[PDB]
Amino acid sequence: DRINTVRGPITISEAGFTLTHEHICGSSAGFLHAWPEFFGSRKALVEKAVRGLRRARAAGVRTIVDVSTFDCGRDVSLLAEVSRAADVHIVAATGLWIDPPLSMRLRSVEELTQFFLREIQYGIEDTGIRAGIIKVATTGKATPFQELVLRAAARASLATGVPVTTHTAASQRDGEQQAAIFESEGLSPSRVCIGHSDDTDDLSYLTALAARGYLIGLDGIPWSAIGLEDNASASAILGNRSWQTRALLIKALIDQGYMKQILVSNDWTFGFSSYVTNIMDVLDRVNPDGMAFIPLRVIPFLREKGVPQETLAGITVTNPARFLSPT
Amino acid sequence: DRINTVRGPITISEAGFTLTHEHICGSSAGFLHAWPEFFGSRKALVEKAVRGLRRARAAGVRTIVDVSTFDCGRDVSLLAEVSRAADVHIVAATGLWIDPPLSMRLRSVEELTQFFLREIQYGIEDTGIRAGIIKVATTGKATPFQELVLRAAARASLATGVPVTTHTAASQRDGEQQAAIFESEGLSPSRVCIGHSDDTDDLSYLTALAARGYLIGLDGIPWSAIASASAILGNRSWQTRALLIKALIDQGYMKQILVSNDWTFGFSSYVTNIMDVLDRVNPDGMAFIPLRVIPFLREKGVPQETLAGITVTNPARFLSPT
Ligand SMILES: CP(=O)(O)OC1CCCCC1
Ligand SMILES: CP(=O)(O)OC1CCCCC1
Ligand SMILES: [Co+2]
Ligand SMILES: [Co+2]
Ligand SMILES: [Co+2]
């Protein structure tokens, strides 16, 4: 009984192969409840999620960390239903993403701390499901509110031992400002993952954060718009860098002695409403493997390039276990 | 069985004294469900709402129209519970307010029309409760998205007969631009209420819209401040806001007037403890219209039959699906 999942507490050894940054549904607070027909039906979304997670389990995945926050449309009852049906452990998140409502954005650092602590210690909504990770975000220079969220996340982490994971605009080196704010609150770098770090080729930025003890989130490996770059909306979110380029950053960080600081994921989803219509159809064509992309296509790629089996197992099993474990 | 309420359909006769622009709780989508301790507890908010609605009922109110939209934190199950315990009919709303999320603000006019139609024709969430009004908003010159919302609201109204009610920045005269968009869509002015119209003293703006067939929403009479409270309430007294009703009755537009309090029992979409400030400014709550505004208008010479026309007849005709 170490890490909290949507099905209850599980031991560290039960976690196994873990994908540290995933989503079942990328939405907005209350959206799925009010407009399930946007995703066909709630039933259709569940079935797609169950099929995808089952295919991921068949490939080796045993646990995923759903980093969807309140404002990213997190529906823990959906997470619970799909987790049980697919028999894959799902770790839920607290925190705030890039779209907080008025009721969240007018809150003080003390109130935000209480909200995060409530979702970790008491439970999310009336479900009794407790969060096992805190998700925060910046998109360039932090706004006065985003600073309060980072500080509240740090205080929530210090009181519970629960890790913090971030969304960054990696090209703008956001991880450095986030790191500075986290450390001013006394939070240990070993409890933080600087996410979306594969969105940049700046190895100097990645190694420096890794040297300080930060976990590096190389979480969007299948995101590439190569071939279909005519669609401005798809190119803006996927990027023009290949999956191989993003995957070679895993090799680059190992080669420099930071294998213990790497966390790999797909940043996949089965539903996506917080972007243009039919983006889900575009995503499923680019990567038909879904969450199964890491064990099926990335792990054999790194094995072909010379990376040993034990360090890859250490990246996919040992690093997430050490990160998610409350300390 | 024509007007949809949170407890099912009711007739025109059952509506009675109706407050056309009210809120049980002003929040954000999913907020009350995720953080009920912010309001003390869900039980505390329900109890405050029931006592508040019972006070309005004892003062003569039979129906209130909760204009809280999806993004304004509307929880129809809460509206259903408080309606039951207080024996006051509550009409739920669809539409979008000033805080739409990414999943709403990236939608086309066709998709927003489908959403509004869903809430009116099928039901809200999984409750089976259908909306009886469409709420929309502009805060000055309409943003490209706000134009899309106004058009989708008109299309949803034209397909159902359900009325449209608006939130305006009355000092910037949004009602004229809202009117132009509604008319371009083919929406009849008699199906539209230009709300927050009592935030301005410009009578020429109100009478011109009323002459075109629009309903004028003089809905924030208790909102007066005579830090962050002064920015939302304003430096104008309730008597000045109430005299605008008489000024419109005199200009011959008693049939175009809709009066309300724009009150709430929970408010999370603003600064903390804003409720303690509001409850001291107006301890009458939703009962402010029949207890303070109606006797004030009676004192100024306005007959009981035109006041009964404004509070009973006008809302029934407005809410009736046509
Ligand atoms: C900008 P980010 O990729 O973290 O958010 C998205 C939410 C919907 C699923 C894909 C991810
Ligand atoms: C500016 P608006 O009329 O939406 O103010 C409302 C006050 C009551 C809570 C919901 C907001
Ligand atoms: Co993500
Ligand atoms: Co308003
Ligand atoms: Co209002």
Contacts of A230 (CB under 8 A, 6+ apart): none
Residue with the two structure tokens 């703006």: B205
The helix (run of H) or strand (run of E) holding residue A133 is strand A133-137
User: In whole angstroms, what is the distance from residue B130 CA to residue A125 CA?
Assistant: 25
Contact between B111 and B150 (Cβ < 8 Å): no
Contacts of A236 (CB under 8 A, 6+ apart): none
Contacts of A18 (CB under 8 A, 6+ apart): A61, A62, A63, A64, A65, A316, A317, A320, A321, A324
| CA–CA distances in Å: residue A9 to residues A69, A77, A299 | 20, 16, 29
Contact between A205 and A173 (Cβ < 8 Å): yes
Contact between B317 and B2 (Cβ < 8 Å): no
Contacts of B37 in chain A (CB under 8 A): 114, 118
Contacts of B114 in chain A (CB under 8 A): 37
Expressed in angstroms, the distance from the first to the final Cα of chain A is 14
Contacts of A276 in chain B (CB under 8 A): 106
Query: DSSP class of residue A296?
Result: I
- C-alpha A13: how far from chain center: 21
- Chain A residue closest in CA terms to B271: A106
SS3 A167: strand
Q: How many residues does chain B have?
A: 322
Contacts of B99 in chain A (CB under 8 A): 101-102
The helix (run of H) or strand (run of E) holding residue A94 is strand A93-95
Rounded to the nearest 5°, which phi and psi values hold at B122?
A: -100, -60
Contacts of B192 (CB under 8 A, 6+ apart): B163, B164, B165, B166, B178, B179, B182, B214, B215
Rounded to the nearest 5°, which phi and psi values hold at A261?
A: -105, 0
Query: DSSP class of residue A217?
Result: E
Contacts of A282 (CB under 8 A, 6+ apart): A228, A231, A234
User: In whole angstroms, what is the distance from residue A18 CA to residue A295 CA?
Assistant: 10
The helix (run of H) or strand (run of E) holding residue B46 is helix B42-58
Task: Tell whether B227 is within 8 A of chain A (Cβ).
Answer: no
Query: What b/e string do you get for A246-280 counting C-beta neighbours within 10 Å, with b at 16 or more?
Result: bbbbbeebbeeebbbbbbbbbbbbbbbbbbbeebb
Contacts of A294 (CB under 8 A, 6+ apart): A19, A61, A221, A264, A265, A266, A316
Q: Of the residues B262, B270, B288, which should be mutated to test ligand 2's pocket, given the most ligand atoms within 8 Å of the CB? A: B262
| CA–CA distances in Å: residue B48 to residues A314, B234, B279, B306 | 55, 26, 11, 32
Burial grade of A281 (CB within 10 A; 0-12, 13-18, 19 or more): exposed
Beta bridge partners of B134: B94, B164
Contact between B216 and B257 (Cβ < 8 Å): yes
Q: How many CB atoms lie within 10 A of CB B72?
A: 29
Contacts of A16 (CB under 8 A, 6+ apart): A62, A63, A317
- Chain B residue closest in CA terms to A97: B102
Provide DSSP, A226-271.
TT-TT-HHHHHHH-SS-HHHHHHHHHHHHHTT-GGGEEE-----S-
B29 to A27: CB separation less than 8 angstroms, yes or no? no
Which ligand does the CA of B285 lie closest to? Answer: 2
B10: left (phi over 0), alpha (psi -120 to 50) or beta: beta
Ligand 2-lining residues (CB < 6 angstroms): B 23, 26, 72, 167, 262, 264, 267, 269
Residue with the two structure tokens 């976990």: A215
Closest by CA position to B59, among listed B304, B262, B289: B289
Contact between B134 and B96 (Cβ < 8 Å): no
Contacts of A35 in chain B (CB under 8 A): 115, 118
Q: How many CB atoms lie within 10 A of CB B283?
A: 11
Nearest to A103 among B31, B118, B124 (CB): B31
B102 to A28: CB separation less than 8 angstroms, yes or no? yes
| Alpha-helix runs per DSSP H in chain A | 12-15, 31-34, 42-58, 76-86, 102-105, 109-121, 144-160, 174-184, 203-211, 232-238, 243-255, 279-286, 293, 299-304, 309-313, 319-324
Contact between B175 and B202 (Cβ < 8 Å): no
Residue with the two structure tokens 């908010």: B45
Domain parsing of chain A, residue ranges? 1-327
Contact between A293 and A267 (Cβ < 8 Å): no
Residue with the two structure tokens 């960054």: A168
Q: How far is B15 from chain A (nearest CA, A)?
A: 27
Closest by CA position to A88, among listed A2, A1, A7: A7
Closest by CA position to A222, among listed A16, A12, A2, A22: A22
Burial grade of B152 (CB within 10 A; 0-12, 13-18, 19 or more): buried
What are the tokens at A299? Answer: 């792990």
Task: Tell whether B159 is within 8 A of chain A (Cβ).
Answer: no
Pairing of strands A8-10, A93-95: unpaired
Task: Tell whether A101 is within 8 A of chain B (Cβ).
Answer: yes
Q: How many CB pairs under 8 A join A and B?
A: 94
For residue B42, the one-letter residue type is: R
Number of alpha carbons in the 13 Å side-chain half-sphere of residue B278: 24
Interface test with B, best of A102, A107, A139, A237 (most B CBs within 10 A): A102
Rounded to the nearest 5°, which phi and psi values hold at B181?
A: -70, -45
B167 is in an annotated binding site: yes
Q: How many CB atoms lie within 10 A of CB A128?
A: 10
User: In whole angstroms, what is the distance from residue A166 CA to residue A20 CA?
Assistant: 11
Rounded to the nearest 5°, which phi and psi values hold at B68?
A: -70, 125
Q: Of the residues A78, A267, A276, A279, which should be mutated to test ligand 1's pocket, given the most ligand atoms within 8 Å of the CB? A: A267
CA of A90 to the centre of ligand 3 (A): 14
Nearest to B111 among A98, A125, A277 (CB): A277
Pairing of strands B215-218, B257-259: parallel
User: In whole angstroms, what is the distance from residue A143 CA to residue A148 CA?
Assistant: 9
Rounded to the nearest 5°, which phi and psi values hold at A225?
A: -105, 15
User: In whole angstroms, what is the distance from residue A81 CA to residue A67 CA?
Assistant: 17
Contact between A23 and A267 (Cβ < 8 Å): yes
Q: Which fold has domain A1-327?
A: TIM Barrel (3.20.20)
B87: left (phi over 0), alpha (psi -120 to 50) or beta: left
| CA–CA distances in Å: residue B61 to residues B17, B263, B287, B299 | 5, 14, 8, 21
What are the tokens at A186? Answer: 């006394």
Q: How many CB atoms lie within 10 A of CB B59?
A: 18
Contact between B20 and B259 (Cβ < 8 Å): yes
Beta bridge partners of A192: A164
Contacts of B186 (CB under 8 A, 6+ apart): B154, B158
Ligand 1-lining residues (CB < 6 angstroms): A 23, 26, 167, 267, 269, 272, 274
Determine the longest span between alpha carbons in chain A, in angstroms: 51
CA of A23 to the centre of ligand 1 (A): 7
- C-alpha B193: how far from chain center: 9
Interface of B with A in 265-304 (CB under 8 A): 268-272
> What is the sign, positive or negative, of the torsion defined by CA atoms of B247, B251, B254, B257?
negative
Contacts of A141 (CB under 8 A, 6+ apart): A172, A177
Q: Which fold has domain B1-322?
A: TIM Barrel (3.20.20)
Provide DSSP, B70-100.
GGGT--HHHHHHHHHHHT-EEE-EEE--S--
What are the tokens at B144? Answer: 């490209």
